[PDB]
RNA sequence: CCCCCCCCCCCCCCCCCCCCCCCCCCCCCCCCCCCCCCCCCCCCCCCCCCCCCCCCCCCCCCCCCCCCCC
């Protein structure tokens, strides 16, 4: 009889963030550098110069990477993207003086990077006995992609500390950019990665510009070996800040008996509401946290603390949890879910139900001692 | 009920790589040689010259092959293909042969050396060299490209691995071509092609378009029909894991029923469903060096991968596959079952659908 | 013929609200084997054979309807 006692709050919460017919015009006076498509070779060389020699300062390293994206996406198509990201920022087309005059980037810095690289080229060409192959020169076309791959690794760990990201970036860069490091052993991964964190934090609109480069690159027929790596780093970044929802499906897949607890059963409708909002938002739902979108956070499992406890317990038991700081509301439920998952982890079973074999093939399978 | 706990992440992952309304313009200043259709006979002769004599350097051998493709596809239709591959590279029409990027010195060397070999041999042959042995034979560019096709198949592995495979197979496959042009240096020609496919990435999809185009024609050459057949064995590029996955199902490996493997079912399904979502281009994704590729990775399902590999090992297919084995335990088990399966002979009188007078005689 | 009674409606009470709480935070490139396809045999046809053929107009009876009351 007691039906009708129900509020679909989370859907309404989202519905209100669509009703805004009015659009925000933030970053009113702001100006950022854009490079026309025509200067792609010049910016490619500059990218290579950053990797090629051990430089004094890697401040603008990230802005140079964005400048390659600019050439790749569009002379002026970039302004469109930035305007549409919500930022009313204006663009400034970088010129030549032969060198590059990038807006916001100190002329002194550009000259330093070039000077230092030429010095290193001269030292090495004397040793090599005038023999430096194409693949080791700052002129190699994949050098901007290599630069951006360090940015891609810091992009993945934008969800945590400026610090945490640098660890992960360095560790993975060693395995991932293995061969790039062989040709440019002078690339200072930590300083380059720091420039990218600083950039993504200050110029928030460059987060969605990076996403658009990724989206665009992901579409092309033929990609570079370096390009195909970039997108693959970018993909591992999809479940950004939603680690809890993905571990939630893992808890269901593990068939953790704690998901059947009466206190957890009570939170079912809230949990369902969150997963149904993901479907309501579609593909953009995943990269919401990555874009630093204010909309994000509606995908919080704060409303269901007992469920979160079980999900984390299950993750701990299976040995996935690692260094996740996520608070555990119900310590009791966590420990229980953990125990079951640990017992599950070790136990070996065979579903002859799933296989769908003849009971003459299922007969022979039993014979396996 | 506990059912709304589902994320179709892999589909969304792909869906995001379609939403890009903006297009990448890479290779901004780049220039590559194209040969107009009109010069097909001249480039045919040059191809034959590479095979006919033992040359000092086989650097541009691959670029010459691409130049024949250029004549075959279109005087200027080639620019369209390259532009549409994602590369904004510009083309340069080769004049009278003065091929763009190819040293005039090299062209002259190849010609000079071939004429020298023709003169030496014509003295021995007593002025008698049949058409089929001359660099002028029309199938010489196809022969050249077939060496390229073999290195195209092994673009998934080392520059090295590919050369082994290329040489081995070329001996059996290009058996008769080698009889007429015994001077063709398969390893140097194959090296030129690896270098080319690695440097000029847009030529990978140009090669694919030649293959696609050749595959369509009503009448092909004996050499042409070979080229496509090499190109076909290249379809399951980098997806060896998914194809061995169907083999594990066909073998009815009981390890696919393991609880830990059963847990990964939804991820595995998601990958095979993405193949269907992408359709025919799905296969050659890895071959094109497409950034899109890699979404077809079975990294998300390590226990399944372990079983698939175990099954392959047991059946004796695995060969020289370096693919990492996450669950050594599951692998060994799947391997044991597959080895027992391999030897065992059984008959499904259920499948055959015989009369129980034919099924009577079969027991005998 | 039908129809034939009775008949306004309303009329109390009553503000709403008042707690708590940012979210997030782990890990992770992918790839990697083998492999040209084909290959046998094979003209088809071959006979017989016009169908049709009988008989047979149908029709043929009887019958206005309506008719009360209100």
SS (HEC) of B174-221: CHHHHHHCCCCCHHHHHHHHHHHHHHCCHHHHHHHHHHHHHHHCCCCC
Query: Residue A350: phi, psi to the nearest 5?
Result: -125, 125
Helix (H) or strand (E) holding B92: strand B90-93
DSSP B99: -
Distances in Å between the Cα of A315 and the Cα atoms of A254, A255, A332, B114 are 10, 12, 15, 69
Cβ-based neighbours of A110, under 8 Å, separated by 6 or more:
A46, A99, A100, A101, A102
Angstrom distance, A318 CA to C7 C1'? 83
Secondary structure, 3-state, chain A: CCCCCCCCHHHHHHHCCCCCCCCCCECCCCEEEECCHHHHHHHHHHHHHHHHCCCCCCCCHHHHHHHHHHHHHCCCHHHHHHHHCCECCEEEECEECCCEECCCCCHHHHHHHHHHHHHHHHHHHHHCCCCCCHHHCCCCCCHHHHHHHHHHHHHHCCCCCHHHHHHHHHHHHHHHCHHHHHHCCCCCHHHHHHHHHHHHHHCCHHHHHHHHHHHHHHHCCCCCHHHHHHHHHHHCCCCCCCHHHHHHHHHHHCCCHHHHCHHHHCCHHHHHHHHHHHHHHCCCCHHHCCCCCCCCCCCCCCCCHHHHHHHHHHHHHHCCCCCCCCCCCCHHHHHHHHHHHHHHHHCCCECHHHHCCCCCCHHHHHCCC
Distance of CA A102 to the CA centre of its chain: 27
Smallest Cβ–Cβ distance between A272 and the set B4, B260, B263 belongs to B4
Q: What was the elucidation method?
A: X-ray
Cβ-based neighbours of B161, under 8 Å, separated by 6 or more:
B154
Look at strands A95-96 and A31-34 and give their pairing: unpaired
Smallest Cβ–Cβ distance between A37 and the set B25, B252, B295 belongs to B25
Tell me the three state secondary structure of residue B347.
coil
End-to-end CA distance of chain B: 57
Chain A residues in contact with B7 by the CB 8 A cut-off are: 245-246, 249, 275, 278
User: B293, A228: Cβ pair inside 8 Å?
Assistant: yes
b (16+ CB within 10 A) / e for B99-116: bbebeeebbeebbebbee
Closest chain A residue to B299, measured at CA: A236
- Residues paired with residue A91 on neighbouring β-strands, in sequence order: A32
User: A351, B291: Cβ pair inside 8 Å?
Assistant: no
CB B7 within 8 A of CB A246: yes
- Residues paired with residue A90 on neighbouring β-strands, in sequence order: A31
| Interrupted backbone of chain B, residues before each interruption (C–N > 2.5 Å) | 96
Pair of tokens at residue B360: 């009577």
Interface of B with A in 112-171 (CB under 8 A): none
Distance CA A15, CA A31 (A): 33
Is B1 part of the contact surface with chain A (CB cutoff 8 Å)? Answer: yes
Angstrom distance, B318 CA to C34 C1'? 9
Nucleotides, chain C, CB distance < 7 Å: 21-37
Rg, Å, chain B Cα set? 25
In a 13 Å sphere around the CA of B320, the CA atoms on its Cβ side amount to 6
Angstrom distance, A131 CA to C46 C1'? 88
Distance CA B298, CA A247 (A): 18
A and B: number of Cβ contacts within 8 A: 183
DSSP character string of B241-302: HHHHHHHHHHTT-GGGGBHHHHTTHHHHHHHHHHHHHHTTTTGGGTTTT-TTTTTT--SS-H
Chain A residues in contact with B336 by the CB 8 A cut-off are: 368
Pair of tokens at residue B173: 């496959």
DSSP B90: E
Q: What is the resolution of this structure in A?
A: 4.2
Interface of B with A in 3-42 (CB under 8 A): 4-7, 9, 12-13, 15-20, 22-29
Query: Residue A277: phi, psi to the nearest 5?
Result: -75, -35
Tell me the three state secondary structure of residue B230.
helix
Angstrom distance, B80 CA to C36 C1'? 31
User: A283, B15: Cβ pair inside 8 Å?
Assistant: yes
User: A238, B9: Cβ pair inside 8 Å?
Assistant: yes
Cβ-based neighbours of B291, under 8 Å, separated by 6 or more:
A217, A218, A220, A223, A224, A227, A228, A230, A231, A232
Pair of tokens at residue A155: 């992009």
CB B232 within 8 A of CB B150: no
Q: Find the nucleotide nearest B286 (Cα to C1′).
A: C31
Q: Find the nucleotide nearest A232 (Cα to C1′).
A: C29
Distance CA A341, CA A315 (A): 8
Is B87 part of the contact surface with chain A (CB cutoff 8 Å)? Answer: yes
Neighbours of B266 (CB within 10 A): 17
Cβ-based neighbours of B176, under 8 Å, separated by 6 or more:
none
Mutate to test the interface with A, among B208, B265, B291 (most CBs of A within 10 A): B291
User: A216, B23: Cβ pair inside 8 Å?
Assistant: yes
């Amino acid at each position: 009889s007691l039906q009708g006692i129900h509020l679909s709050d989370l859907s309404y919460k989202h519905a209100i963030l669509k009703e805004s017919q009015y659009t925000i015009k933030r970053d009113v006076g702001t100006t950022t550098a854009v490079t026309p498509s025509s200067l792609q070779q010049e910016i490619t060389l500059l990218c290579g110069e950053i990797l090629y020699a051990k430089h004094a300062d890697y401040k603008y390293a990230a802005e140079i990477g964005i400048q390659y994206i600019s050439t790749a996406l569009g002379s002026e198509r970039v302004q469109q993207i930035l305007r549409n990201s919500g930022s009313e920022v204006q663009v400034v087309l970088t010129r030549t003086y032969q060198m590059l005059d990038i807006h916001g980037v100190e002329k002194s810095w550009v000259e330093e990077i070039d000077k230092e690289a030429r010095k290193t080229m001269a030292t090495l060409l004397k040793e090599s006995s005038g023999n430096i192959p194409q693949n080791q020169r700052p002129s190699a076309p994949d050098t901007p992609i290599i630069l951006l791959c360090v940015g891609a690794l810091i992009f993945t760990k934008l969800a945590s500390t400026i610090e945490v990201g640098l660890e992960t970036t360095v560790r993975r860069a060693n395995r991932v950019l293995s061969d790039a490091l062989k040709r440019y052993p002078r690339m200072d991964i930590p300083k380059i990665a720091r420039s990218f964190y600083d950039l993504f934090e200050q110029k928030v609109y460059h987060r969605s510009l990076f996403i658009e480069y990724g989206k665009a690159l992901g579409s092309s027929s033929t990609g570079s070996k370096a390009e195909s790596l970039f997108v693959n780093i970018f993909m591992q970044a999809y479940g950004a800040g939603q680690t809890m929802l993905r571990w939630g499906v893992i808890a269901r897949s593990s068939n953790n008996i704690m998901l059947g607890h009466v206190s957890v059963q009570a939170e079912l409708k809230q949990v369902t509401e969150v997963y149904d909002l993901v479907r309501e938002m579609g593909p953009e739902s995943g990269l919401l946290h990555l874009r630093q979108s204010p909309k994000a956070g509606l995908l919080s499992l704060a409303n269901c603390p007992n469920f979160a406890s079980v999900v984390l317990g299950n993750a701990s038991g299976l040995g996935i949890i690692g260094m996740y700081r996520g608070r555990v509301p119900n310590t009791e439920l966590f420990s229980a879910a953990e125990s079951y998952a640990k017992s599950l982890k070790e136990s070996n079973k065979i579903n002859f139900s799933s296989l769908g074999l003849t009971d003459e093939e299922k007969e022979a399978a039993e014979h396996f001692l």
